[PDB]
Amino acid sequence: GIDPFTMTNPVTVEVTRGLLVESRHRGAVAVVDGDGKLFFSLGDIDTAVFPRSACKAMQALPLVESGAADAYGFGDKELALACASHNGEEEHVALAASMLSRAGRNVEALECGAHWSMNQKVLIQQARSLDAPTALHNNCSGKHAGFICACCHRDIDPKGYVGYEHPLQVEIRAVMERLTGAVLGAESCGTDGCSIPTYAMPLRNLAHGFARMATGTGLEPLRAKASRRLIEACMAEPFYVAGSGRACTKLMQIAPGRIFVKTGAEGVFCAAIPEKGIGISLKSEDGATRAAEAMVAATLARFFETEETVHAALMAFAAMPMRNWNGIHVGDIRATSVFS
């Protein structure tokens, strides 16, 4: 059932080995329509959680609403990259560089720092082709290029754009408060991996914000139109949101143009299904990506019970097999029956 106020997270994902549960994850999920009505919840959807990268599409609204995306000729690939936690594959790097170039800037304008890919196969490619990663390899480089472009198009100096009272960060707080109805302030702020603010808010508000983006409900016309554009871009070019081997990219290849998903660090996922009018947010309590992936897939699957092929493809992510170094099947990562 639905409890807006419980503080207790149920077991949402089991990891088996042999015939026994070896590890278990707890978590919380909110599913909300464009009007804010709760369709499904699990666990604590009231305590503030940090969305991390899961809200990058909300943070991309300045890039679109300012007219910068249109002025620089950005299409679906650039918008998807601005919404991305990308693998740092060379396609992502070259596209981020071209976004900066069109605004008259380069990698030196980035304030996010560098890191090696969090995808092991891409990390191996990076190690073999690079002495060290650059800021363009950072998973947030498309988001940050979007920030720099939003500033340059408006003649706002991008220097310091990560700072709490830089005009860009002022604007992003206002956007996020309006979309989500949450109160965003220093007491709920932390610093993200890319050195910008990240604001903790209840999962219910996060899901409602995505439901609004997906449906337009409660949004002024320009924000509704820009939200559609960002959601459609991510669904149209899902490699640019994540990349090779990544669950967000593959989830958005199951039912092309119909499902929006986005991961955040520490086990957050956000999602939306525009044709159903719904937004989803969730978090695995311990922060594991594998648990958040199984949870988002099991939650999405409930909306596709009438379409076997889509349902089966989503359930393949809700129940993932594990193989050891010899290829032997050893167990599975499975969403529990709370999702059924």
Least distance (Å) between residue 92 CB and its own copies: 16
* Euclidean distance between CA atoms 13 and 4, whole angstroms: 21
H helices within the chain, ranges in order? 56-59, 61-65, 68-71, 76-82, 90-102, 120-129, 141-153, 167-180, 203-215, 221-236, 247-251, 289-301, 308-318
Q: Toward Zn ion, which CB reaches closer, 164 or 220?
A: 164
Whole-angstrom CA distances from 64 to 13, 46, 227 are 37, 31, 9
DSSP 281: E
Q: What is the separation of C-alpha 34 from the centre of its chain, rounded to a whole number of angstroms?
A: 19
The DSSP bridge pattern shows strands 48-49 and 201-202 to be antiparallel
Q: Is position 2 an interface residue for its own copies (rule: CB under 8 A)?
A: no
Contact residue for Cl ion among 178, 228, 258, 302 (CB under 5 A): 178
Q: Is position 234 an interface residue for Zn ion (rule: CB under 5 A)?
A: no
Tokens standing for residue 85: 């936690």
Could you tell which of its own copies, Zn ion, Cl ion, none binds residue 113, using a CB distance below 5 to 8 A set by kind? its own copies
Count of Cβ atoms closer than 10 Å to residue 167 Cβ: 16
Select from 87, 94, 93 the least CA-distant residue to 121: 87
Q: Is position 20 an interface residue for its own copies (rule: CB under 8 A)?
A: yes
Find out whether 92 and 86 touch, Cβ atoms under 8 Å: yes
Q: Is position 163 an interface residue for its own copies (rule: CB under 8 A)?
A: no
Could you tell which of Zn ion, its own copies, Cl ion, none binds residue 326, using a CB distance below 5 to 8 A set by kind? its own copies
**35 labelled as ligand-binding?**
no
Site string for its own copies, 132-151 (x = CB under 8 A): ------x-------------
Least distance (Å) between residue 37 CB and Cl ion: 5
Q: Toward Zn ion, which CB reaches closer, 194 or 214?
A: 194
| Residue ranges in contact with Cl ion by CB under 5 A | 37-38, 178, 219-220, 223, 288-290
| Residue ranges in contact with its own copies by CB under 8 A | 15, 17-20, 22-26, 48-50, 111-116, 120, 123-124, 127-128, 138, 187-195, 198, 200, 266-267, 284-288, 291, 324-328, 330-331
Binding residues for Mg(2+): 155
